[PDB]
Amino acid sequence: MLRDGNEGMSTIPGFNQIQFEGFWRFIDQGLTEELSKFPKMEDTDQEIEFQLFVETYQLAEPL
Amino acid sequence: DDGMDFPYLDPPLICCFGAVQKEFVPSVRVSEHQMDPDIYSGWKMMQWNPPEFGRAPGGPVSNVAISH
């Protein structure tokens, strides 16, 4: 994703875009690209199975 | 109209006839490039690269008189 592209090219950009953009990129993509790396671990007895659906994650409003 | 006694002052006067206006740009055409309809913070990028008719845009006659 990209905001107004002409930021830093027409005005002095805010001295926050490093941390802000890093956190937004993390929330947008790192969660997806790390949840997919979660395996399909299970038991050797062929009796149980655990699955983590990836394209269903969401966050909650802080209490 | 003939009323005068002494000769005129050293710098010759200039006659400026027209309309008195504030920050007016008469010459307007269709510029090829536009820079966002809402964000005016980036419109200054059109002053580094003028549309070839607003390169040296003249204005009202009051501006010319003041500059003179």
Q: What string of DSSP letters covers chain A?
A: ----S-SSSSSPPPTTHHHHHHHHHIIIIIHHHHHTTS---B-TTSS-B----STT-------
Q: Are A10 and B44 in contact (CB under 8 A)?
A: yes
User: How close B28 comes to chain A (CA, Å)?
Assistant: 24
Q: What angle do CA B54, B56, B58 make, to 5 degrees?
A: 90
Backbone break loci in chain A, preceding residues, C–N > 2.5 A: none
- Do you know the residue count of chain B? 68
The method recorded for this entry reads cryo-EM
Instruction: Write the single-letter amino acid at B17.
Output: F
A contact test, residue of B41, B44, B49 with most A CBs within 10 A: B41
Amino acid at A31: L
A8: nearest CA partner in chain B: B42
- Give burial (CB, 10 Å; 0-12/13-18/19+) of B59: middle
Bridge partners, residue A49, by sequence: A42
Q: Which residues contact B9 (CB under 8 A, 6 or more apart)?
A: none
Q: Report d(CA A25, CA A2) in Å as an integer.
A: 11
Q: Are B22 and B59 in contact (CB under 8 A)?
A: no
How far apart CA A10 and CA B2 sit, in angstroms, is 59
Interface check B47 vs A, CB under 8 A: no
Data resolution in angstroms: 3.2
> Chain A closest CA to B50's CA: distance in Å?
15
